């Protein structure tokens, strides 16, 4: 198999410390991630923390090279480390190929998020021709409309509305107050945060003598497997065919996906991104916070767009792309902005000077 | 009557194909839009699709000149066409002045969106001094507060909250989970998507010795007729007088309209637009996706602002307006950004060189 | 005590007029703000309005120097004025140090917002081990989860969801349809508008061979006293430690606060601001509408960032900061943008010309 590496690994990992009322031995945690325990496996662990923040009842890890210098000083009970960093480490190491990935897996063992038991709350309204798997949970005041299908092991939070004929595949999780319109089809293991709206009618109007005329939005939405949708994110239904979200797509908070957008597998979009109608984004792309795409363009695979960029055209070459200006102190920025308005004149004058010299 | 034309007609129409369980004859569809059927009117039609996407049971249309070349190859059962394009067309044409406008009208005939019957759900809470017209529908777990007025033929979705004294005019449609605060007055035929919040208190604070002091927001909101409000869009109440939205205004998703904004008739705003307090926008304007307006400025009629522009001043001349930079590959953008910071120096040096030559 | 002044005072105050069904005498209003009534205190006042907008039954004020010229022409029943402006004023003055601050206080006396009586609506679901103070109000269809604590004088609106172990301190106000996830701790006198989501899981993923792997977000949120949170604003929970919001922080609508952000006391953020993970903002800062911050940077105290700026680095000096370009007519902007792409070439050519001369 060919080696893999992704530049996102460079990103600083948030610092912090979590103390839990749960406990696991180091041996139990190591077994979960296939770690070799170099030291006593019997130590109880009652939380997780980054190196400088960790105490003796917590497991830590080394993720960023910038914190390697603090490893020998950490008060952590044990540390997830590569074999190289474990060599000569004074404490207990849990030796793994990738400490951060191991931490990612272990984090779930300490999660305090509520887990609902199977069953439908007495106050939930479920249409007679809707089908809710007996292993699913449906919370208080949720509404499940005609023909909807709720798969095995799905959690539907309080106040969710699941529109007519909409489908949630096995293992899905919807926080309280998620809205699906009709004809939204979702694959397996979705995760949707509160306030998300999926399948709304987007802007579909034609101008007739100055007056906007509504176009009915009669497509739906198709979402693949292993998709994340952040808080208050909106995804429009299609005009005729479905808006399409691929497998493993991870959408942050307050994103706007317009009608008929297509997002390829394993693409990530950071918060506040807006994608205009019919834009097509390939696989393994990343859009940073606040990026906008104009409509009816295509982005090829392996494209990264930096924060607050306005993407105005199709991208056919992998790489990173940007727009905007450097931040400056306001008084300095004002001078730069004034000169930008003079650029056409400046260019003309430079050309004339070159002719003269 | 003077001729009309709008540049928005240039926009590419989304491709797609919708197959329906409903059917209409070509004659029935033609009658709905005043089309002349050149061919057999008896053909059943079971959906709508764009030219390259259409099959023989679907009606299509020609909207963009870029797809005219595909007309003779379309597998559509029939096509909405101008008389000019119908001349020499091998299949069945439905001849109309404007194929796209005809399609816009016909799209509604195939819409699968749920239509609630008149009546108030047993779980809806309606204040004794609220007035709900008997032809209105009110969905499950909706709350209608004191003095609210729900007009004839209005649909209030599940979980809506309609605040005290708020009014929804005849023929309005609110998706599930719309919130109106108190003293929101809406005219006829509104359409509001899920998650919208109308009448909230916006940022109203004065600084006293470094501490922000709340100003009560004691105006309301007035919205005209035929207004669209997209998913998770917010419109603040006014400080003293109402925030004002004119007739035929079409607002896309995730828009933020601040306190005391005024929007003139037939203006359209694309998704993620933010309008700061007391900005006044005229009639027949269009703001593209992600545009921002600073507060206390005025935009005249017939102004178009391109995507992600920051509008910093009043606009008194009709036309198009922009800010930002071209998108470049990141490494190239970084060089451009570095030179922008040097522009004041560059200008000074160009002036000195001109003096020397 | 040292004198105070803040530049925000320069901002234009929205115009308007509010007529009320409530009434107070001038004497009662004056007593509320410690004003000296120069004229008859017995006049009933039935609303508030700005100078040019006011009628004889309303109290007005002078806030912006730009409206001083209209003072003698105002039809207001009385006007809040400094001693300097009251000198030679023909009508009734209410003399105060700061007319706008006095108006801010008085505005609350005319607020029509509903005030719920103490008690829990029969349709509210309150966990047996949740604690709701008897002086709190809980609206229809609200859900209060296990271990949650609702303090004295708190108002929980209809359809709110208060997650497990979450805390709302004394005097808090939540509009209808606010969502708190589990382990959100809020201090006293919070004000949260409809649609806000507090404590959601933000984007927490690591890339493994092209596939995003979920990191559990097992921190919570800590919010101080006197915080405002606008409509549809989202605040993520932390990865390990809590996301932190200080005292007196005022957040406008449609803001996105990412995981592990820290916001210092008395900072204000305008609508549509997005703050990426682990950014730290100091005290007494202001971010204008649509500002974005990249992750893992720090902003010192007393920093102002202008609208739609992309903040790319830590700020260590107080002051104002900006990015972007001036708005231009589109055709002119296009020429400027083309020249920006030529800047590296232009700089090289200017250097060569200087060498030649
Ligand atoms: Cl680390
Ligand atoms: Cl077409
Ligand atoms: Cl004033």
C-beta neighbour count of B264 within 10 angstroms: 21
Q: Which of B4, B108, B259, B266 is flagged as catalytic?
A: B259
Q: Closest Cα to residue C319, out of A165, A115, A203, A328?
A: A328
Helix ranges, chain C (H): 26-33, 83-86, 99-107, 330-341, 343-356
Task: State whether residue C79 sits within 8 Å of chain A by CB.
Answer: no
Other beta carbons less than 10 A from residue C222's beta carbon: 19
CB count within 10 Å of CB A355 equals 7
- Which ligand has the minimum distance to the alpha carbon of residue B66? 2
Query: How far does residue A86's CA lie from ligand 2's centre (Å)?
Result: 64
For residue C94 the two structure tokens come to 């209410």
DSSP strand pairing (C17-25 vs C44-49): antiparallel
What separation in Å is there between the alpha carbon of C94 and the centre of ligand 3? Answer: 15
Q: Are C16 and B238 in contact (CB under 8 A)?
A: yes
Tokens of B100: 């796209």
Method of determination is X-ray
- Ordered by where they begin, the domains of chain A are 1-117 (3.40.1390.10), 118-329 (2.160.10.10), 330-357 (1.20.5.170)
Structure tokens belonging to residue C300: 């010192």
Catalytic site includes residue B108: no
- CA C79/CA C68 separation, integer angstroms: 12
**Separation of alpha carbons B250 and C96, rounded Å:** 45
Q: What residues are paired with A310 via a beta bridge? A: A292
C220 C-alpha vs ligand 1 centroid, how far in Å? 20
Q: Are B58 and B29 in contact (CB under 8 A)?
A: no
CB-neighbour burial class of residue B73 (10 A; exposed 0-12, middle 13-18, buried 19+) = exposed
Q: How far apart are the C-alpha atoms of A236 and A57, rounded to whole Å?
A: 47
Q: Is C30 left (phi over 0), alpha (psi -120 to 50) or beta?
A: alpha
CA distance C252 to C317: 25
C-alpha to C-alpha distances, C18 to A319, B185, C68, C103, C288, nearest whole angstrom: 56, 15, 21, 13, 28
Please judge whether A232 and C234 are an interchain contact, meaning their C-beta atoms are less than 8 angstroms apart.
yes
Residues of A in Cβ contact (< 8 Å) with B305? none
C62 in Cβ contact with C84 (< 8 Å): no
Give the full edge-to-edge strand order of the sheet including A243-245.
A131-132, A149-150, A167-168, A184-186, A221-223, A243-245, A262-263, A280-281, A298-299
* Number of Cβ atoms within 10 Å of the Cβ of A41: 17
User: Under an 8 A CB cutoff, do C253 and B256 touch?
Assistant: yes
β-strand pairing of C250-251 with C268-269: parallel
Which strand (E) or helix (H) includes residue A236? strand A234-236
Using DSSP's 3-state secondary structure scheme, residue B175 falls into coil
Q: Which residues contact C84 (CB under 8 A, 6 or more apart)?
A: none
In the DSSP assignment, the letter for residue C242 is P
Q: Which residues of B touch A234 (CB under 8 A)?
A: 195, 230-232, 253-254
Given a contact cutoff of 8 angstroms between Cβ atoms, the answer to whether A276 and B272 are in contact is no
CB-CB neighbours of C221 under 10 Å: 26
Check: CB of residue B253 under 8 Å from CB of residue B231.
Answer: yes
Spell out which residues of chain A touch residue B11, defining contact as CB-CB under 8 Å: 295
Partner C contacted by B333 (CB < 8 A): no
Closest Cα in chain A to B7: A207
Give whole-number Cα distances, A269 to A305, A326, B253, in Å.
10, 22, 18
Distance of residue B92 Cα from the nearest chain C Cα, in angstroms: 43
CB-based contact, C145 to chain A, within 8 Å? yes
Phi and psi of B242, rounded to 5°?
Answer: -75, 145
Q: Hey, are the CB atoms on A330 and C278 less than 8 Å from each other?
A: no
Nearest to A229 by CA among A168, A284, A142, A279: A168
Please tell me the distance in Å from A339's CA to the nearest CA on chain B: 6
Residues from chain C contacting residue B202 (CB–CB below 8 Å): 230, 252-253, 271
- What is the DSSP pairing of strand C44-49 with strand B36-38? unpaired
Minimum distance, in Å, between the CA of residue C103 and any CA atom of chain B: 8
Q: Closest by alpha carbon to B132, among B172, B93, B92, B98?
A: B172
DSSP 3-state assignment of B59?
strand
Q: Is C122 on the interface with B (CB under 8 A)?
A: no
| B-interface mutation test, from A147, A194, A234, most B Cβ less than 10 A away | A234
The answer to whether the CB of B267 falls within 8 A of the CB of B246 is yes
Cβ–Cβ contacts within 10 Å for residue A223, how many?
29
No. of helices (H) and no. of strands (E), chain C: 5, 39
Longest dimension (CA), chain A: 87
A245/chain C closest Cα distance in angstroms: 15
Closest CA to C76 of C91, C98, C86: C91
Rg (CA), chain C: 26
Q: Could you please report the per-residue DSSP string of A188-222? A: TT-EE-TT-EEEE----EEEETTEEEEPP----EE
Place of tokens 């060599």: A87
Q: What is the CA radius of gyration of chain A?
A: 26
* Exposure letters B308-343 (e unless 16+ CB within 10 A, then b): bbbbbeebeeeebbbbbbbbbebeebbebbebbbeb
C-alpha B168/C-alpha B147 separation (Å) is 12
User: How far away, in angstroms, is C304 Cα from ligand 1 center?
Assistant: 32
In the numeric block, the tokens 């008997």 are attached to B134
B165 touches chain A (CB under 8 A): no
Distance B67 CA to ligand 2 centre (A): 5
Q: Which two tokens stand for residue B286?
A: 């269009």
Question: From the CA of B288, how far away is ligand 2's center (Å)?
Answer: 22
* C-alpha pair distances (Å), A31 with each of A99, A292, B103, C246: 14, 44, 61, 41
């Amino acid at each position: 198999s060919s080696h893999h590496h992704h530049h996102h690994s460079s990103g600083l990992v948030p610092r912090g410390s979590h103390m839990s009322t749960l406990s696991y031995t180091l041996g139990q945690l190591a077994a979960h991630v296939g770690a070799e325990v170099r030291g006593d496996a019997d130590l109880p662990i009652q939380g997780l923390a980054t190196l400088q923040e960790a105490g003796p009842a917590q497991l830590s890890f080394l993720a960023n090279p910038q914190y390697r210098k603090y490893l020998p000083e950490s008060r952590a009970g044990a540390v997830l480390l590569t074999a190289a960093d474990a060599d000569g480490f004074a404490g207990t190491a849990l030796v793994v190929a990738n400490p951060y990935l191991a931490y990612a897996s272990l984090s779930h063992l300490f999660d305090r998020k509520p887990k609902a038991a199977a069953g439908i709350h007495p106050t939930a309204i479920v249409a007679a021709d809707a089908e809710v798997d007996p292993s699913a949970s449906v919370g208080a005041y949720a509404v499940i409309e005609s023909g909807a299908r709720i798969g095995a092991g799905v959690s539907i939070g309080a106040h969710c509305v699941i529109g007519a004929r909409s489908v949630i595949g096995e293992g899905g999780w919807l926080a309280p107050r998620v809205t699906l319109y009709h004809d939204v089809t979702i694959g397996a293991r979705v995760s949707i945060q509160s306030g998300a709206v999926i399948g709304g009618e987007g802007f579909g109007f034609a101008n007739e003598k100055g007056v906007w005329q509504k176009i009915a939005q009669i497509g739906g939405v198709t979402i693949g497997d292993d998709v994340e949708i952040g808080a208050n994110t909106t995804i429009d239904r299609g005009a005729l065919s479905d808006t399409l979200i691929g497998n493993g797509v991870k959408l942050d908070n307050q994103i706007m996906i317009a009608h008929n957008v297509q997002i390829g597998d394993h693409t990530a979009m950071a918060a506040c991104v807006g994608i205009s109608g019919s834009a097509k984004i390939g696989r393994h792309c990343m859009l940073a916070g606040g990026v906008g795409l104009v409509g009816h363009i295509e982005i090829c695979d392996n494209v990264f767009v930096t924060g607050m960029t306005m993407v105005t055209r199709s991208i056919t070459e992998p790489g990173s792309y940007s727009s905007g200006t450097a931040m400056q102190p306001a008084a300095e920025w004002k001078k730069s902005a004034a000169r930008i308005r003079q650029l056409d004149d400046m260019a003309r004058r430079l050309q004339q000077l070159e002719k003269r010299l």
